[PDB]
Design a binder for these strands. Sequence first.
RNA 1: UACGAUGAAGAGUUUGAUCCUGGCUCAGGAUGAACGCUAGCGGCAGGCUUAACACAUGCAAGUCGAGGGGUAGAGACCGGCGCACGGGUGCGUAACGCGUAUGCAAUCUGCCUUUCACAGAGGGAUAGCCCAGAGAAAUUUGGAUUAAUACCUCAUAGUAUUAUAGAGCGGCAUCACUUUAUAAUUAAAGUCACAACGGUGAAAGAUGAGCAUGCGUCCCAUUAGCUAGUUGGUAAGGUAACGGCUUACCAAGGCCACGAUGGGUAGGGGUCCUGAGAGGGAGAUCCCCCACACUGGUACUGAGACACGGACCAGACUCCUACGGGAGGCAGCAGUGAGGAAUAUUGGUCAAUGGACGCAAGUCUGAACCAGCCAUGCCGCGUGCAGGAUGACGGUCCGGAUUGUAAACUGCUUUUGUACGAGAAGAAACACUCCUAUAUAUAGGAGCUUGACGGUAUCGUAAGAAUAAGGAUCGGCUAACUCCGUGCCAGCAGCCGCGGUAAUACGGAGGAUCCAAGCGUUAUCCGGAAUCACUGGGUUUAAAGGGUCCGUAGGCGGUUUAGUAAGUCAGUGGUGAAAGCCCAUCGCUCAACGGUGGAACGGCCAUUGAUACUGCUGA
Lengths: 194, 85, 121, 70
Amino acid sequence: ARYTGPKTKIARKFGEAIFGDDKSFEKRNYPPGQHGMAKKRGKKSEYAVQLMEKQKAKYSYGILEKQFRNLFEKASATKGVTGEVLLQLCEARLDNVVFRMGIAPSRRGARQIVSHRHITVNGEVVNIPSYHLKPGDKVAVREKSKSLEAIERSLYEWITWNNDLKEGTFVSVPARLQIPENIKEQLIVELYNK
Amino acid sequence: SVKIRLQRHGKKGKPFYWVVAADARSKRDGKYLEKIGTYNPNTNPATVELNLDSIVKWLHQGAQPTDTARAILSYKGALLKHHLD
Amino acid sequence: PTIQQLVRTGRTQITKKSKSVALDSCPQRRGVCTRVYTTTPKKPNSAMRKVARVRLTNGNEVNAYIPGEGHNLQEHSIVLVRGGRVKDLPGVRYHIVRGALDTSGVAGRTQRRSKYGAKRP
Amino acid sequence: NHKSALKRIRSNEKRRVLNRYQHKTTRNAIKALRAKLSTVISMIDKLAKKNIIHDNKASNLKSKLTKHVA
RNA sequence: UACGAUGAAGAGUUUGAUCCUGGCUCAGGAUGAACGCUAGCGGCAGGCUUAACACAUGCAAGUCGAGGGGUAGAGACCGGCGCACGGGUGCGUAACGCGUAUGCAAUCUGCCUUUCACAGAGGGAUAGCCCAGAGAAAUUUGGAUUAAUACCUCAUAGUAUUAUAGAGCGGCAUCACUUUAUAAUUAAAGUCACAACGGUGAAAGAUGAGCAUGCGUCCCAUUAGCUAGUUGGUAAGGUAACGGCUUACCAAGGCCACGAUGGGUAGGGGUCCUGAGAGGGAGAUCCCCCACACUGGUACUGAGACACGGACCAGACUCCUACGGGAGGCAGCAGUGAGGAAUAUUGGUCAAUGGACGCAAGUCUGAACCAGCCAUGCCGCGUGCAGGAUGACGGUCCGGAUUGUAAACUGCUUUUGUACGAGAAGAAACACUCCUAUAUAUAGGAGCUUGACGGUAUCGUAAGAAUAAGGAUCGGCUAACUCCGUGCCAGCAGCCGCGGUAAUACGGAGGAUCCAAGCGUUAUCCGGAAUCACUGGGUUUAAAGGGUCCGUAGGCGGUUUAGUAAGUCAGUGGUGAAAGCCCAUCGCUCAACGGUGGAACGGCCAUUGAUACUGCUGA
């Protein structure tokens, strides 16, 4: 399933615009609710800190707790940095790459364009948002819905995107020092090892 | 009579057979003697992985192939090689 | 202690006696009630808790506690015991599922509807 | 019962009468024989041929017979 | 400043307050799960854990006319093969039953493969049919009788068997393999002609089936003696085969504290869950071994059974009866009654694979492949995406804040749902007519060929955000707070514990948190529990030194030196099935799933080395 709800609320309950720094991030930036607008609780537990740091990443991309735990224990099979490979495989998702390529300016629109047979991956059309893009994939756009109204309206360090043929040539898997995200993976690892 | 037959081991809808020599009094996909080859009729060429080093050995020891077994061992060899005395 | 003593007689592992024993290790058990009455807690609580003497299908006489408010529970009714003791009534070590075969649910309940067997309004 | 089931109870009787005949005919001889020794060996070998007496056991009997007649 | 190892969290609660020991509970994972609330699909997997309780009805093992007489117009019978496979259950069994490693010089082996020697003459019967019956039926009794690849005589045949007599080789004791004479004894089958299929004997191989052995095989010592064919031997009967397996005789032996015997429970393993690991808990589904077929016993046929859908006898149930007598066994598939908290269609097809029969065509196959039901579990998707003001309405404060870009409204997409049009793979073959070579063995190519699923998967076309979100929690543990009503009442509760009239703990409303087609409770397990501690605890005062010595079995061993190499270490060969977990890589649009490879299987047997440490022998 998906969230399918207010995104400004999710941005306010975390204090960080993860769906685009735009309207409503200011103008009562404090968390929502009749008791969040007032002086919140001062003492915040480390469990609350770790849980919210996990939920920030779980909400930014649109992953459920089940799939997030599956991906975490999948990435934990790598002998390297567990949080690093976790974030790498979370960024390697198809909808995330489509969102980073400029199309679908939000991930909520990425996981509505990728789930409509509007985008192709290495030839055959792949309409699975959770598709794991391995380094060295070729993402194109279906010629039927190539000249749409929203695609051209909406149109990184590792994505080589070409606007003439809707290219993007996903290669050179990025690292934590390159992926811009305000999340701490060590806290997520400690929470899942709790 | 030890026979050379096929064991189904694929998934529902897409079969995948093991060409294996086994006794006739055993279940289809259960006990066997020695795996010989492999048959995949999921592509147009109908891929096979026959082992002519043991196929002719079992045929000399007294194996008895079935219709599909002797049709797979036909266009992969070891039959025109088992005939040569 | 000594390795020779351990080789002779090793460490004795206990069996970890269970909690709910008179239900034959089943999640729920059907039963028929014989006496529905009210009892008092120990201390310092003060109430009138509703309990029923239930005879399970395996020939076991237990005391079950009726949760919530509103029920029929006549002198003979088919109930479904599930388990879970209470720290107020000495002897009552089981609970009755609300919403079972013959027992009633609850009316006017809107918060905890999965429990107490209440339909969605 | 089956059609094949109501054929073995009928054929095995015709087999068993002959088997019992040929078995007792030589059992009485090997009993009241303990020289006409070269007359029960033929019957023992015929039983072994008919698979009644298991040529292994038949040879056991043949060896045990001509060992005390000496 | 390298190597490998990707791995280890706590909290509440005894007291006015502190520390320590110590018990209880919670935070996590999992399931043949059940119950309550809720509910849109697809792929795959699973589905009587209880009464091995009783079964109505349908199907589940038949085939060969190229063995025979061949009848009506096929059926039935003799004969060959199969029915000992496949399928189901876990009653019983504490044991060579099972796992593991070997041995058989104490073994057998239909069908299958490869060689050698042959398939010569004869005869009497009897099925089926005919003539009469005795019986309600089941079923059965007389007469004469025609065939066989049915049966039975003689001759023939050995690297066949037995006995006597010579030998060689070779041991691991009993003795083993081969060869030579002599004597005795044991076979056949033909389908009118060809093709094609057959038959007998001997040897070898493969496969299958047995016996024995070393090791590991639950609890109770509030079970200390057990065994009388029992222990060993001498001769017979035997079984495929050694053997007290059985009998006759002689002796009194054999097991037992390193647990006999007795009682309770239980099919065993590969494996599944959990755990950092060592360990702990179970033995569904997949595979291997064992036991059973209403409860018990016995034997025949057969290579193979003491036989699920074969026979006989006895017992308890159900049915028929003319009262004399008879027929039965869903622990096979689908189903019924009962029991239970709880587990499904009286479905389709042999189209693929396997099995039986047949030269083949072909027949049967509730094995098997599909389909229906159950959110039971795993995986994936959706219930829209962008812009848009602080709008009504609610809860709250004394006009403000809250739900809130949330809404109304403005543009876009149909994944999914409906309608229409196209549309698969799973199918490789078998059998018959054509030329080639060699030899009756193999090989190529041709088309009318061969789909239950199924017009199923999949693709395209046209309206339309339309066809789709709920459950738990909010005092601490633990993520989330305000008001109204009740006033120790109603009630809540995993622990501390809350409610006696200003309840963040009860019921309702608003808001908030988590999960999500699922959410909670219960029941059974592992972790936390270092809370049975080898890893990894203690005994002055928290539970814990025997009242004290002697001493049996047992446990431990001062220094040096010589020998062996039992423990220990290293190498090699065999094995440690497949499946399953992990790693890597490919195909289902990803995943689940499937294919391939490696690692692992910590173990065991044989052999070759090292001798530092332990054991043995000597000084």
